[PDB]
Structure 1
Protein backbone atom coordinates (compact mmCIF):
# COMPACT_ATOMS: atom_id res chain seq x y z
CA UNK A 1 0.00 0.00 0.00
CA UNK A 2 1.00 3.67 -0.29
CA UNK A 3 2.26 5.32 2.90
CA UNK A 4 -0.13 8.18 3.77
CA UNK A 5 -3.25 6.05 3.38
CA UNK A 6 -1.76 2.98 5.01
CA UNK A 7 -1.08 5.49 7.81
CA UNK A 8 -4.70 6.61 8.24
CA UNK A 9 -5.82 2.98 7.96
CA UNK A 10 -3.62 2.03 10.94
CA UNK A 11 -4.75 5.06 12.94
CA UNK A 12 -8.46 4.38 12.34
CA UNK A 13 -8.00 0.68 13.16
CA UNK A 14 -5.67 1.35 16.12
CA UNK A 15 -3.26 -1.43 15.14
CA UNK A 16 0.18 0.22 15.58
CA UNK A 17 1.18 -2.27 18.29
CA UNK A 18 0.34 -5.22 16.02
CA UNK A 19 2.26 -3.79 13.05
CA UNK A 20 5.28 -3.12 15.27
CA UNK A 21 5.19 -6.60 16.77
CA UNK A 22 5.20 -8.12 13.26
CA UNK A 23 8.42 -6.19 12.51
CA UNK A 24 9.96 -7.50 15.74
CA UNK A 25 9.01 -11.08 14.79
CA UNK A 26 10.47 -10.89 11.26
CA UNK A 27 13.70 -9.05 12.17
CA UNK A 28 17.08 -10.70 11.58
CA UNK A 29 18.98 -12.52 14.30
CA UNK A 30 22.75 -12.71 13.83
CA UNK A 31 25.49 -13.49 16.38
CA UNK A 32 27.07 -10.83 18.63
CA UNK A 33 29.78 -12.98 20.24
CA UNK A 34 32.48 -10.29 20.53
CA UNK A 35 30.11 -7.93 22.41
CA UNK A 36 29.43 -10.61 25.04
CA UNK A 37 33.07 -11.49 25.88
CA UNK A 38 33.74 -10.79 29.59
CA UNK A 39 36.54 -8.31 28.83
CA UNK A 40 33.96 -6.05 27.11
CA UNK A 41 31.35 -5.79 29.88
CA UNK A 42 32.27 -2.19 30.76
CA UNK A 43 32.16 -1.22 27.05
CA UNK A 44 28.38 -1.85 26.80
CA UNK A 45 25.77 0.47 28.30
CA UNK A 46 22.87 -2.03 28.09
CA UNK A 47 23.20 -5.82 28.23
CA UNK A 48 20.41 -6.34 25.66
CA UNK A 49 21.78 -3.94 22.97
CA UNK A 50 24.81 -5.30 21.11
CA UNK A 51 26.33 -4.94 17.62
CA UNK A 52 26.23 -7.96 15.32
CA UNK A 53 29.65 -9.46 14.60
CA UNK A 54 29.26 -9.16 10.82
CA UNK A 55 28.63 -5.38 10.82
CA UNK A 56 30.45 -4.11 13.93
CA UNK A 57 32.99 -1.28 13.66
CA UNK A 58 36.50 -2.43 14.57
CA UNK A 59 38.96 -0.11 16.30
CA UNK A 60 42.47 -0.14 14.74
CA UNK A 61 44.07 -1.57 17.86
CA UNK A 62 45.56 -5.00 18.50
CA UNK A 63 44.80 -5.19 22.23
CA UNK A 64 41.01 -4.79 22.08
CA UNK A 65 39.23 -3.70 18.90
CA UNK A 66 35.71 -3.59 20.38
CA UNK A 67 33.21 -0.70 20.43
CA UNK A 68 29.41 -0.86 20.59
CA UNK A 69 28.88 0.52 17.06
CA UNK A 70 27.44 -0.84 13.76
CA UNK A 71 27.82 0.05 10.02
CA UNK A 72 24.41 0.37 8.33
CA UNK A 73 25.11 0.22 4.54
CA UNK A 74 22.06 1.09 2.36
CA UNK A 75 22.87 -0.14 -1.15
CA UNK A 76 20.03 1.30 -3.27
CA UNK A 77 19.99 4.65 -1.46
CA UNK A 78 23.81 4.87 -1.57
CA UNK A 79 24.03 6.05 2.05
CA UNK A 80 26.00 4.65 4.99
CA UNK A 81 25.62 5.41 8.72
CA UNK A 82 27.45 4.35 11.87
CA UNK A 83 24.96 3.87 14.74
CA UNK A 84 26.45 3.74 18.25
CA UNK A 85 25.50 4.04 21.94
CA UNK A 86 26.13 7.20 23.90
CA UNK A 87 29.75 7.04 25.08
CA UNK A 88 30.51 5.74 28.59
CA UNK A 89 33.17 7.17 30.94
CA UNK A 90 35.56 4.39 29.87
CA UNK A 91 34.76 4.64 26.11
CA UNK A 92 35.02 8.37 25.25
CA UNK A 93 38.55 7.83 23.88
CA UNK A 94 37.38 4.85 21.79
CA UNK A 95 34.50 6.96 20.40
CA UNK A 96 36.84 9.67 19.04
CA UNK A 97 39.30 7.02 17.82
CA UNK A 98 36.40 5.62 15.70
CA UNK A 99 35.47 9.08 14.34
CA UNK A 100 39.13 9.57 13.30
CA UNK A 101 39.71 6.11 11.79
CA UNK A 102 36.43 6.05 9.83
CA UNK A 103 37.00 9.60 8.40
CA UNK A 104 33.62 10.87 9.56
CA UNK A 105 32.81 14.57 9.13
CA UNK A 106 29.77 14.79 11.41
CA UNK A 107 28.44 13.45 14.72
CA UNK A 108 24.63 13.46 15.27
CA UNK A 109 23.47 13.44 18.95
CA UNK A 110 19.74 12.95 19.65
CA UNK A 111 19.71 12.91 23.51
CA UNK A 112 20.63 15.18 26.42
CA UNK A 113 23.46 14.21 28.78
CA UNK A 114 20.89 13.99 31.62
CA UNK A 115 17.30 12.86 31.04
CA UNK A 116 14.70 11.65 33.57
CA UNK A 117 17.18 12.58 36.35
CA UNK A 118 19.83 10.04 35.22
CA UNK A 119 22.95 10.17 33.06
CA UNK A 120 22.29 8.99 29.47
CA UNK A 121 25.86 9.50 28.14
CA UNK A 122 29.19 11.00 29.18
CA UNK A 123 30.07 14.70 28.65
CA UNK A 124 32.34 13.72 25.75
CA UNK A 125 33.05 17.13 24.12
CA UNK A 126 34.44 20.39 25.59
CA UNK A 127 32.07 23.14 26.67
CA UNK A 128 34.55 26.07 26.60
CA UNK A 129 37.05 27.08 23.90
CA UNK A 130 39.91 27.52 26.36
CA UNK A 131 39.38 24.12 28.12
CA UNK A 132 40.28 21.45 25.57
CA UNK A 133 40.08 17.67 26.20
CA UNK A 134 42.91 15.15 25.89
CA UNK A 135 42.15 11.41 25.59
CA UNK A 136 45.38 9.78 26.72
CA UNK A 137 44.39 6.17 26.02
CA UNK A 138 43.93 6.91 22.27
CA UNK A 139 46.26 9.96 21.90
CA UNK A 140 43.71 12.50 20.63
CA UNK A 141 43.02 16.15 21.44
CA UNK A 142 39.60 17.79 21.01
CA UNK A 143 38.93 21.57 20.99
CA UNK A 144 35.68 23.54 20.84
CA UNK A 145 36.00 26.08 17.97
CA UNK A 146 32.49 27.62 17.87
CA UNK A 147 28.93 26.94 18.98
CA UNK A 148 25.58 28.07 17.51
CA UNK A 149 22.59 27.56 19.86
CA UNK A 150 19.14 27.55 18.26
CA UNK A 151 15.70 26.85 19.69
CA UNK A 152 15.57 23.12 18.86
CA UNK A 153 19.21 22.18 18.22
CA UNK A 154 22.81 23.33 18.60
CA UNK A 155 25.64 23.06 16.02
CA UNK A 156 29.25 22.98 17.15
CA UNK A 157 32.52 23.16 15.24
CA UNK A 158 35.20 20.95 16.82
CA UNK A 159 38.90 20.33 16.01
CA UNK A 160 40.18 16.76 16.42
CA UNK A 161 43.97 16.33 16.43
CA UNK A 162 45.80 13.03 16.16
CA UNK A 163 48.67 13.67 18.57
CA UNK A 164 50.80 10.85 17.07
CA UNK A 165 50.93 12.52 13.61
CA UNK A 166 49.89 16.14 14.40
CA UNK A 167 47.21 15.91 11.69
CA UNK A 168 44.01 17.91 12.38
CA UNK A 169 40.42 17.69 11.14
CA UNK A 170 37.25 19.72 11.51
CA UNK A 171 34.27 17.75 12.93
CA UNK A 172 30.68 19.09 12.99
CA UNK A 173 28.52 18.22 16.06
CA UNK A 174 24.75 18.32 15.35
CA UNK A 175 22.87 18.18 18.69
CA UNK A 176 19.08 17.81 18.70
CA UNK A 177 18.21 19.14 22.17
CA UNK A 178 14.40 19.01 22.40
CA UNK A 179 13.27 15.36 22.11
CA UNK A 180 10.88 14.91 25.09
CA UNK A 181 11.87 12.83 28.12
CA UNK A 182 8.78 10.62 27.47
CA UNK A 183 7.12 9.73 24.15
CA UNK A 184 7.85 11.34 20.75
CA UNK A 185 7.45 14.89 19.41
CA UNK A 186 3.92 15.98 18.54
CA UNK A 187 4.99 17.39 15.14
CA UNK A 188 7.93 16.16 13.00
CA UNK A 189 8.68 19.68 11.75
CA UNK A 190 11.68 20.47 13.95
CA UNK A 191 13.19 16.97 13.49
CA UNK A 192 12.91 17.32 9.69
CA UNK A 193 14.44 20.82 9.80
CA UNK A 194 17.32 19.30 11.80
CA UNK A 195 17.80 16.46 9.28
CA UNK A 196 17.98 19.00 6.44
CA UNK A 197 20.66 20.98 8.34
CA UNK A 198 22.78 17.83 8.69
CA UNK A 199 22.33 17.13 4.96
CA UNK A 200 23.27 20.68 3.94
CA UNK A 201 26.57 20.44 5.87
CA UNK A 202 27.98 17.65 3.67
CA UNK A 203 28.19 15.21 6.61
CA UNK A 204 26.01 12.57 4.87
CA UNK A 205 27.76 12.74 1.50
CA UNK A 206 30.01 10.15 -0.19
CA UNK A 207 33.13 12.36 -0.08
CA UNK A 208 33.34 11.67 3.68
CA UNK A 209 33.30 8.60 5.90
CA UNK A 210 29.91 7.62 7.38
CA UNK A 211 28.18 10.00 9.79
CA UNK A 212 28.23 8.80 13.44
CA UNK A 213 24.71 8.89 14.99
CA UNK A 214 23.80 8.17 18.62
CA UNK A 215 21.25 8.51 21.39
CA UNK A 216 21.50 6.57 24.67
CA UNK A 217 21.33 2.98 23.29
CA UNK A 218 21.82 3.93 19.62
CA UNK A 219 18.68 2.14 18.30
CA UNK A 220 15.56 4.20 18.99
CA UNK A 221 15.84 7.91 18.13
CA UNK A 222 18.98 6.99 16.12
CA UNK A 223 16.95 4.50 14.08
CA UNK A 224 14.27 7.12 13.43
CA UNK A 225 16.90 9.52 11.98
CA UNK A 226 18.44 7.08 9.46
CA UNK A 227 15.09 5.50 8.52
CA UNK A 228 13.57 8.88 7.66
CA UNK A 229 16.66 10.03 5.70
CA UNK A 230 16.90 6.82 3.61
CA UNK A 231 13.16 6.69 2.84
CA UNK A 232 13.12 10.32 1.62
CA UNK A 233 16.22 9.73 -0.56
CA UNK A 234 14.58 6.66 -2.17
CA UNK A 235 11.43 8.70 -2.91
CA UNK A 236 13.62 11.16 -4.87
CA UNK A 237 15.54 8.46 -6.77
CA UNK A 238 12.70 6.16 -7.94
CA UNK A 239 10.29 6.62 -10.85
CA UNK A 240 7.40 5.71 -8.55
CA UNK A 241 7.81 7.30 -5.08
CA UNK A 242 4.72 5.51 -3.73
CA UNK A 243 6.63 2.22 -4.07
CA UNK A 244 8.83 3.05 -1.05
CA UNK A 245 7.79 0.68 1.76
CA UNK A 246 8.95 2.00 5.14
CA UNK A 247 8.47 -1.37 6.86
CA UNK A 248 10.68 -3.08 4.26
CA UNK A 249 13.37 -0.40 4.59
CA UNK A 250 13.35 -0.81 8.39
CA UNK A 251 13.71 -4.58 8.10
CA UNK A 252 16.68 -4.06 5.73
CA UNK A 253 18.34 -1.72 8.28
CA UNK A 254 17.73 -4.29 11.05
CA UNK A 255 20.00 -6.71 9.17
CA UNK A 256 22.86 -4.43 10.34
CA UNK A 257 21.86 -3.46 13.94
CA UNK A 258 19.28 -5.01 16.28
CA UNK A 259 16.29 -3.22 17.70
CA UNK A 260 16.05 -0.14 15.45
CA UNK A 261 12.84 1.73 16.40
CA UNK A 262 12.06 0.81 20.03
CA UNK A 263 8.30 1.48 20.34
CA UNK A 264 5.14 1.60 18.24
CA UNK A 265 5.04 5.36 18.92
CA UNK A 266 8.50 5.72 17.33
CA UNK A 267 7.24 3.73 14.32
CA UNK A 268 4.24 6.03 13.90
CA UNK A 269 6.47 9.09 14.28
CA UNK A 270 8.78 7.77 11.52
CA UNK A 271 5.80 7.44 9.14
CA UNK A 272 4.68 10.98 10.02
CA UNK A 273 8.15 12.38 9.38
CA UNK A 274 8.52 10.73 5.95
CA UNK A 275 4.99 11.78 4.91
CA UNK A 276 5.45 15.44 5.79
CA UNK A 277 8.99 15.50 4.51
CA UNK A 278 7.95 14.25 1.08
CA UNK A 279 5.71 17.33 0.59
CA UNK A 280 8.41 19.83 1.42
CA UNK A 281 10.96 18.26 -0.90
CA UNK A 282 8.85 19.25 -3.91
Structure 2
Protein backbone atom coordinates (compact mmCIF):
# COMPACT_ATOMS: atom_id res chain seq x y z
CA UNK A 1 0.00 0.00 0.00
CA UNK A 2 1.79 3.09 -1.30
CA UNK A 3 0.72 6.74 -1.05
CA UNK A 4 -1.24 6.68 -4.32
CA UNK A 5 -3.50 3.96 -2.90
CA UNK A 6 -4.19 6.21 0.09
CA UNK A 7 -4.70 9.24 -2.14
CA UNK A 8 -7.30 7.46 -4.31
CA UNK A 9 -9.16 6.00 -1.29
CA UNK A 10 -9.29 9.37 0.48
CA UNK A 11 -10.29 11.16 -2.72
CA UNK A 12 -13.03 8.63 -3.43
CA UNK A 13 -14.40 9.01 0.11
CA UNK A 14 -14.30 12.79 -0.36
CA UNK A 15 -16.19 12.63 -3.66
CA UNK A 16 -18.91 10.43 -2.18
CA UNK A 17 -19.08 12.56 0.96
CA UNK A 18 -19.21 16.01 -0.64
CA UNK A 19 -21.81 14.86 -3.12
CA UNK A 20 -23.86 13.23 -0.33
CA UNK A 21 -24.10 9.92 -2.23
CA UNK A 22 -24.20 7.46 0.69
CA UNK A 23 -28.01 7.33 0.63
CA UNK A 24 -28.14 6.06 -2.96
CA UNK A 25 -25.40 3.50 -2.36
CA UNK A 26 -27.05 2.21 0.81
CA UNK A 27 -30.41 2.00 -0.98
CA UNK A 28 -28.90 -0.20 -3.74
CA UNK A 29 -27.40 -2.51 -1.08
CA UNK A 30 -30.75 -2.83 0.70
CA UNK A 31 -32.60 -3.32 -2.60
CA UNK A 32 -30.12 -5.94 -3.81
CA UNK A 33 -29.59 -7.83 -0.53
CA UNK A 34 -30.31 -11.54 -0.81
CA UNK A 35 -33.07 -13.35 1.03
CA UNK A 36 -33.08 -16.91 2.30
CA UNK A 37 -35.46 -19.01 4.40
CA UNK A 38 -35.47 -18.63 8.21
CA UNK A 39 -37.81 -21.53 8.93
CA UNK A 40 -36.17 -22.73 12.13
CA UNK A 41 -36.14 -19.20 13.63
CA UNK A 42 -39.87 -18.94 12.88
CA UNK A 43 -40.98 -22.16 14.63
CA UNK A 44 -43.40 -21.45 17.50
CA UNK A 45 -41.09 -23.16 19.98
CA UNK A 46 -38.38 -20.61 19.19
CA UNK A 47 -40.50 -17.52 19.69
CA UNK A 48 -39.03 -16.78 23.12
CA UNK A 49 -35.49 -17.11 21.78
CA UNK A 50 -35.80 -14.16 19.35
CA UNK A 51 -35.59 -10.57 20.52
CA UNK A 52 -37.17 -9.18 17.35
CA UNK A 53 -39.62 -10.88 15.01
CA UNK A 54 -38.10 -9.02 12.06
CA UNK A 55 -34.51 -10.13 12.76
CA UNK A 56 -33.80 -13.81 12.17
CA UNK A 57 -30.84 -15.92 11.14
CA UNK A 58 -31.11 -17.64 7.73
CA UNK A 59 -31.31 -21.44 8.09
CA UNK A 60 -28.24 -22.06 5.93
CA UNK A 61 -25.87 -20.11 8.16
CA UNK A 62 -27.40 -20.21 11.65
CA UNK A 63 -25.24 -21.52 14.50
CA UNK A 64 -26.56 -24.74 15.99
CA UNK A 65 -26.13 -25.44 19.70
CA UNK A 66 -24.69 -28.93 20.21
CA UNK A 67 -27.43 -29.80 22.64
CA UNK A 68 -30.26 -32.12 21.58
CA UNK A 69 -33.29 -30.49 23.27
CA UNK A 70 -33.50 -27.39 21.05
CA UNK A 71 -30.41 -26.35 19.09
CA UNK A 72 -31.75 -22.94 18.14
CA UNK A 73 -30.05 -19.64 18.87
CA UNK A 74 -30.47 -16.38 16.97
CA UNK A 75 -26.87 -16.31 15.73
CA UNK A 76 -25.31 -16.51 12.27
CA UNK A 77 -21.92 -17.60 10.93
CA UNK A 78 -20.43 -15.04 8.56
CA UNK A 79 -17.63 -16.68 6.61
CA UNK A 80 -15.51 -14.38 4.47
CA UNK A 81 -13.51 -16.69 2.20
CA UNK A 82 -11.04 -14.25 0.65
CA UNK A 83 -10.45 -12.30 3.83
CA UNK A 84 -9.99 -15.63 5.60
CA UNK A 85 -12.04 -14.72 8.64
CA UNK A 86 -15.19 -16.03 10.28
CA UNK A 87 -17.43 -14.07 12.64
CA UNK A 88 -20.47 -15.16 14.60
CA UNK A 89 -23.06 -12.38 14.73
CA UNK A 90 -25.80 -12.72 17.30
CA UNK A 91 -28.51 -10.66 19.03
CA UNK A 92 -28.04 -9.32 22.51
CA UNK A 93 -28.89 -12.29 24.78
CA UNK A 94 -32.36 -12.42 26.38
CA UNK A 95 -32.68 -13.39 30.08
CA UNK A 96 -33.57 -16.94 29.01
CA UNK A 97 -30.82 -17.28 26.36
CA UNK A 98 -27.72 -16.30 28.39
CA UNK A 99 -26.94 -19.98 28.92
CA UNK A 100 -27.31 -20.69 25.18
CA UNK A 101 -25.04 -17.73 24.44
CA UNK A 102 -22.20 -19.10 26.58
CA UNK A 103 -22.94 -22.63 25.38
CA UNK A 104 -22.34 -21.34 21.84
CA UNK A 105 -19.16 -19.52 22.91
CA UNK A 106 -17.86 -22.74 24.47
CA UNK A 107 -18.82 -24.98 21.54
CA UNK A 108 -17.38 -22.73 18.86
CA UNK A 109 -14.16 -22.37 20.85
CA UNK A 110 -14.29 -18.57 20.70
CA UNK A 111 -11.64 -16.54 22.52
CA UNK A 112 -13.37 -13.17 22.34
CA UNK A 113 -16.81 -11.60 22.62
CA UNK A 114 -17.38 -8.14 21.14
CA UNK A 115 -20.35 -6.20 22.53
CA UNK A 116 -21.39 -2.96 20.73
CA UNK A 117 -24.66 -1.99 22.48
CA UNK A 118 -25.70 -1.10 26.02
CA UNK A 119 -27.92 -3.12 28.32
CA UNK A 120 -30.62 -0.45 28.31
CA UNK A 121 -31.31 1.56 25.19
CA UNK A 122 -34.23 3.90 24.70
CA UNK A 123 -35.64 2.91 28.06
CA UNK A 124 -35.80 -0.88 27.79
CA UNK A 125 -33.64 -3.97 28.17
CA UNK A 126 -31.86 -4.53 24.86
CA UNK A 127 -29.35 -7.04 26.22
CA UNK A 128 -29.39 -9.02 29.45
CA UNK A 129 -26.24 -8.61 31.55
CA UNK A 130 -24.82 -12.01 30.73
CA UNK A 131 -21.52 -11.30 32.53
CA UNK A 132 -20.73 -10.84 36.25
CA UNK A 133 -19.97 -7.78 38.34
CA UNK A 134 -17.57 -6.91 41.16
CA UNK A 135 -20.17 -7.70 43.85
CA UNK A 136 -20.99 -11.08 42.35
CA UNK A 137 -18.01 -12.13 40.28
CA UNK A 138 -19.43 -15.62 39.57
CA UNK A 139 -22.44 -16.70 37.51
CA UNK A 140 -23.77 -20.20 36.99
CA UNK A 141 -25.95 -20.89 34.02
CA UNK A 142 -29.33 -22.57 34.14
CA UNK A 143 -29.29 -25.91 32.30
CA UNK A 144 -26.06 -25.36 30.37
CA UNK A 145 -23.53 -26.49 33.00
CA UNK A 146 -21.21 -23.53 32.68
CA UNK A 147 -19.75 -21.18 35.27
CA UNK A 148 -18.50 -17.69 34.44
CA UNK A 149 -16.16 -15.57 36.59
CA UNK A 150 -15.01 -11.97 36.11
CA UNK A 151 -11.21 -11.96 36.41
CA UNK A 152 -10.56 -8.33 35.55
CA UNK A 153 -12.31 -5.26 34.25
CA UNK A 154 -10.74 -2.16 32.75
CA UNK A 155 -13.13 0.73 32.16
CA UNK A 156 -12.06 3.36 29.65
CA UNK A 157 -13.65 6.40 28.12
CA UNK A 158 -15.23 4.67 25.10
CA UNK A 159 -15.05 0.98 25.89
CA UNK A 160 -14.38 -1.53 28.62
CA UNK A 161 -12.29 -4.70 28.49
CA UNK A 162 -12.84 -7.73 30.71
CA UNK A 163 -10.99 -10.99 31.21
CA UNK A 164 -13.49 -13.68 32.09
CA UNK A 165 -12.97 -17.31 32.99
CA UNK A 166 -15.45 -19.77 31.49
CA UNK A 167 -15.63 -23.27 33.00
CA UNK A 168 -17.42 -26.41 31.86
CA UNK A 169 -18.75 -27.77 35.18
CA UNK A 170 -18.91 -31.29 33.81
CA UNK A 171 -15.24 -31.49 32.75
CA UNK A 172 -13.68 -28.74 34.87
CA UNK A 173 -11.94 -27.39 31.78
CA UNK A 174 -11.53 -23.61 32.06
CA UNK A 175 -10.95 -21.08 29.30
CA UNK A 176 -10.09 -17.41 29.16
CA UNK A 177 -12.64 -15.26 27.34
CA UNK A 178 -11.84 -11.66 26.52
CA UNK A 179 -14.86 -9.35 26.51
CA UNK A 180 -14.62 -6.15 24.53
CA UNK A 181 -17.49 -3.83 25.23
CA UNK A 182 -17.74 -0.61 23.15
CA UNK A 183 -19.92 1.49 25.43
CA UNK A 184 -20.69 4.60 23.40
CA UNK A 185 -22.30 3.37 20.19
CA UNK A 186 -25.96 4.45 20.07
CA UNK A 187 -28.50 2.21 18.35
CA UNK A 188 -28.82 3.19 14.67
CA UNK A 189 -25.93 5.57 15.31
CA UNK A 190 -22.16 5.71 14.89
CA UNK A 191 -19.15 5.30 17.17
CA UNK A 192 -17.69 8.28 19.02
CA UNK A 193 -15.12 8.76 16.25
CA UNK A 194 -13.16 6.67 13.71
CA UNK A 195 -10.16 6.88 16.05
CA UNK A 196 -11.89 5.40 19.09
CA UNK A 197 -13.52 2.76 16.89
CA UNK A 198 -10.11 1.81 15.42
CA UNK A 199 -8.37 1.78 18.79
CA UNK A 200 -11.12 -0.66 19.85
CA UNK A 201 -10.83 -2.84 16.77
CA UNK A 202 -7.04 -2.98 17.09
CA UNK A 203 -7.32 -3.96 20.75
CA UNK A 204 -9.58 -6.85 19.72
CA UNK A 205 -7.11 -7.77 16.99
CA UNK A 206 -4.01 -7.53 19.20
CA UNK A 207 -5.63 -9.91 21.71
CA UNK A 208 -5.62 -12.68 19.11
CA UNK A 209 -9.41 -13.17 19.34
CA UNK A 210 -9.81 -12.82 15.56
CA UNK A 211 -7.15 -15.39 14.59
CA UNK A 212 -7.93 -18.74 12.86
CA UNK A 213 -6.16 -20.45 15.77
CA UNK A 214 -9.31 -19.70 17.78
CA UNK A 215 -12.95 -20.21 17.01
CA UNK A 216 -14.89 -17.27 15.48
CA UNK A 217 -15.20 -14.10 17.59
CA UNK A 218 -18.80 -13.62 18.79
CA UNK A 219 -20.05 -10.13 17.89
CA UNK A 220 -23.33 -8.68 19.03
CA UNK A 221 -25.30 -5.49 19.56
CA UNK A 222 -29.06 -5.50 20.22
CA UNK A 223 -30.37 -7.12 17.03
CA UNK A 224 -26.90 -8.21 15.89
CA UNK A 225 -27.05 -6.49 12.47
CA UNK A 226 -26.53 -2.72 12.41
CA UNK A 227 -23.57 -2.10 14.69
CA UNK A 228 -22.28 -5.67 14.45
CA UNK A 229 -22.53 -5.37 10.68
CA UNK A 230 -20.60 -2.08 10.62
CA UNK A 231 -17.88 -3.54 12.90
CA UNK A 232 -17.42 -6.64 10.77
CA UNK A 233 -17.50 -4.87 7.40
CA UNK A 234 -14.66 -2.56 8.50
CA UNK A 235 -12.52 -5.39 9.86
CA UNK A 236 -13.04 -7.46 6.71
CA UNK A 237 -12.30 -4.59 4.33
CA UNK A 238 -9.04 -3.79 6.17
CA UNK A 239 -8.10 -7.49 5.99
CA UNK A 240 -8.74 -7.46 2.23
CA UNK A 241 -6.66 -4.30 1.86
CA UNK A 242 -3.75 -5.94 3.65
CA UNK A 243 -4.07 -9.11 1.53
CA UNK A 244 -4.67 -7.82 -2.00
CA UNK A 245 -1.88 -6.72 -4.34
CA UNK A 246 -4.05 -3.66 -5.08
CA UNK A 247 -5.73 -2.50 -1.87
CA UNK A 248 -7.73 0.11 -3.79
CA UNK A 249 -9.65 -2.71 -5.53
CA UNK A 250 -11.82 -3.40 -2.47
CA UNK A 251 -15.48 -2.93 -3.43
CA UNK A 252 -17.26 -1.99 -0.17
CA UNK A 253 -20.77 -2.56 -1.55
CA UNK A 254 -19.89 -5.97 -2.98
CA UNK A 255 -18.26 -7.04 0.31
CA UNK A 256 -21.28 -5.94 2.36
CA UNK A 257 -23.67 -7.70 -0.04
CA UNK A 258 -21.52 -10.83 0.33
CA UNK A 259 -21.69 -10.53 4.11
CA UNK A 260 -25.48 -10.12 3.84
CA UNK A 261 -25.77 -13.57 2.26
CA UNK A 262 -25.04 -14.85 5.80
CA UNK A 263 -27.23 -12.54 7.93
CA UNK A 264 -29.94 -10.07 7.01
CA UNK A 265 -29.73 -6.33 7.50
CA UNK A 266 -25.98 -5.89 8.18
CA UNK A 267 -25.45 -2.12 8.51
CA UNK A 268 -28.68 -0.30 9.26
CA UNK A 269 -28.15 3.29 8.12
CA UNK A 270 -26.39 5.16 5.33
CA UNK A 271 -24.34 6.92 8.02
CA UNK A 272 -23.09 3.56 9.32
CA UNK A 273 -22.07 2.62 5.78
CA UNK A 274 -20.23 5.96 5.56
CA UNK A 275 -18.54 5.38 8.91
CA UNK A 276 -17.33 1.89 7.86
CA UNK A 277 -15.72 3.38 4.76
CA UNK A 278 -14.11 6.13 6.83
CA UNK A 279 -12.88 3.64 9.43
CA UNK A 280 -11.31 1.58 6.68
CA UNK A 281 -9.40 4.37 4.96
CA UNK A 282 -8.23 5.79 8.32
CA UNK A 283 -7.23 2.31 9.48
CA UNK A 284 -5.41 1.57 6.23
CA UNK A 285 -2.88 4.17 7.38
CA UNK A 286 -1.74 1.80 10.13
TM-score greater than 0.5 by the shorter chain: yes
Give the TM-score band, short-chain normalised.
Answer: over 0.9
Q: CA deviation at 1:114?
A: 1.2
Q: CA deviation at 1:6?
A: 3.2
Q: CA deviation at 1:130?
A: 4.8
Q: CA deviation at 1:272?
A: 0.8
**Per the alignment, do residues 30 and 182 of structure 1 end up closer, same or farther by CA in structure 2, a change over 3 Å counting?**
closer
Alignment partners' CA distance in 2, 1:182 and 1:236: 29
Does the 8 Å contact 1:129/1:146 carry over to 2?
A: no
Q: CA deviation at 1:187?
A: 2.5
The corresponding residue for 1:96 is 102
Alignment partners' CA distance in 2, 1:52 and 1:146: 36
Alignment partners' CA distance in 1, 2:164 and 2:192: 32
Does the 8 Å contact 1:82/1:212 carry over to 2?
A: yes
Does the 8 Å contact 1:56/1:69 carry over to 2?
A: yes
Deviations 1:141-192 (A, max 9, x none): 1111111111111110111111111111111101111124663236311000
Does the 8 Å contact 1:70/1:256 carry over to 2?
A: yes
Q: CA deviation at 1:44?
A: 0.3
For structure 1, which runs of at least 5 residues remain unmatched after alignment? none
The corresponding residue for 2:77 is 71
**Per the alignment, do residues 146 and 185 of structure 1 end up closer, same or farther by CA in structure 2, a change over 3 Å counting?**
closer
The corresponding residue for 1:41 is 47
Does the 8 Å contact 2:140/2:148 carry over to 1?
A: yes
**Per the alignment, do residues 186 and 199 of structure 1 end up closer, same or farther by CA in structure 2, a change over 3 Å counting?**
closer
Does the 8 Å contact 1:129/1:143 carry over to 2?
A: no
TM-score, with length taken from structure 2: 0.94
Q: Which secondary structure does the structure 1 equivalent of 2:284 belong to?
A: helix
Does the 8 Å contact 2:238/2:283 carry over to 1?
A: yes
Deviations 1:96-120 (A, max 9, x none): 0000000000000001111222211
Q: Which secondary structure does the structure 1 equivalent of 2:10 belong to?
A: helix
Does the 8 Å contact 1:3/1:245 carry over to 2?
A: no
Deviations 1:55-74 (A, max 9, x none): 00000111110000000011
Alignment partners' CA distance in 2, 1:278 and 1:80: 21
Alignment partners' CA distance in 2, 1:211 and 1:187: 23
**Per the alignment, do residues 261 and 49 of structure 1 end up closer, same or farther by CA in structure 2, a change over 3 Å counting?**
same
Q: CA deviation at 1:25?
A: 1.1
Q: CA deviation at 1:12?
A: 2.6
Q: CA deviation at 1:204?
A: 0.2
Alignment partners' CA distance in 2, 1:257 and 1:228: 16
Q: CA deviation at 1:18?
A: 1.5
Does the 8 Å contact 1:132/1:144 carry over to 2?
A: yes
Alignment partners' CA distance in 1, 2:30 and 2:11: 23
TM-score, with length taken from structure 1: 0.96
For structure 2, which runs of at least 5 residues remain unmatched after alignment? 1-7
Give the length in aligned residue pairs: 279
Alignment partners' CA distance in 1, 2:78 and 2:186: 26
Does the 8 Å contact 1:72/1:82 carry over to 2?
A: yes
Alignment partners' CA distance in 2, 1:186 and 1:12: 21
Deviations 1:36-61 (A, max 9, x none): 00000010001111001000000011
